[PDB]
Design a protein around this ligand. Structure first.
Ligand SMILES: OC[C@H]1O[C@@H](O)[C@H](O)[C@@H](O)[C@@H]1O
Ligand SMILES: [Cl-]
Ligand SMILES: [Cl-]
Ligand SMILES: [Cl-]
Ligand SMILES: [Cl-]
Ligand SMILES: [Cl-]
Ligand SMILES: [Cl-]
Length: 192
């Protein structure tokens, strides 16, 4: 069908955080390996102008200034810290369009357009017409309080969802949504 786009998750893995070798709160304690999915929305037979609105759905504890080593931003920005549920550990999130020239968008509001970033100040801006919508995902872990030594399990958490919007009413009205996931895993703290 013309509008038969279907969602697919985009996921990033706790298991890629290096060992945290250790006091200031909050502070970033490492970055996960950034991930990407070219086909978060895909499958409709008629090309469309599309955009993705990200809404985080974990508790927001506060803000921290940061500049991802990954991505190409040269200035620090404010990021919302989201509660993993594990005491002392939060995450911050950036997202971007799929292709490398689009900028990392810090998640620091209730919702934001991750691509095109122009849509945050122009409600009629969309990606150029094509058959898919993808994105890049960046996450860093944040010490929000004192951490014990040793291994810690992080549960799998849904960080939020991307809503597909379009200037084609029939596609926009479907309110297709795709999950943005933190795959759980183990981290290790070494307190010397
Ligand atoms: O840049 C807009 C879109 O271009 C397409 O060619 C890519 O497959 C999508 O991942 C991307 O969202
Ligand atoms: Cl993915
Ligand atoms: Cl990975
Ligand atoms: Cl992909
Ligand atoms: Cl950044
Ligand atoms: Cl969850
Ligand atoms: Cl229309």
């Amino acid at each position: 069908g013309a509008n038969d786009y279907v969602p697919s998750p985009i996921t990033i893995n706790t298991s890629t955080l290096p060992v945290v070798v250790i006091h200031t709160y909050p502070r970033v304690i490492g970055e996960l390996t950034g991930t990407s999915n070219q086909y978060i929305f895909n499958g409709g037979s008629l090309i469309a102008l599309m955009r993705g609105k990200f809404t985080p759905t974990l508790p927001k504890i506060g803000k921290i200034t940061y500049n991802f080593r990954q991505g190409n931003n040269t200035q620090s920005s404010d990021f919302d810290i989201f509660d993993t549920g594990v005491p002392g550990l939060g995450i911050i999130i950036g997202m971007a369009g799929y292709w490398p020239a689009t900028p990392l968008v810090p998640i620091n509001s209730s919702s934001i357009y991750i691509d095109p970033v122009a849509a945050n100040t122009n409600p009629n801006a969309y990606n150029g017409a094509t058959g898919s919508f993808g994105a890049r995902l960046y996450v860093a872990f944040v010490a929000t309080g004192r951490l014990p030594n040793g291994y810690v399990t992080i549960p799998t958490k849904q960080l939020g969802h991307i809503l597909l919007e379009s200037n084609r009413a029939s596609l926009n009205n479907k309110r297709l949504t795709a999950p943005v996931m933190l795959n759980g895993g183990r981290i290790q703290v070494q307190s010397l």
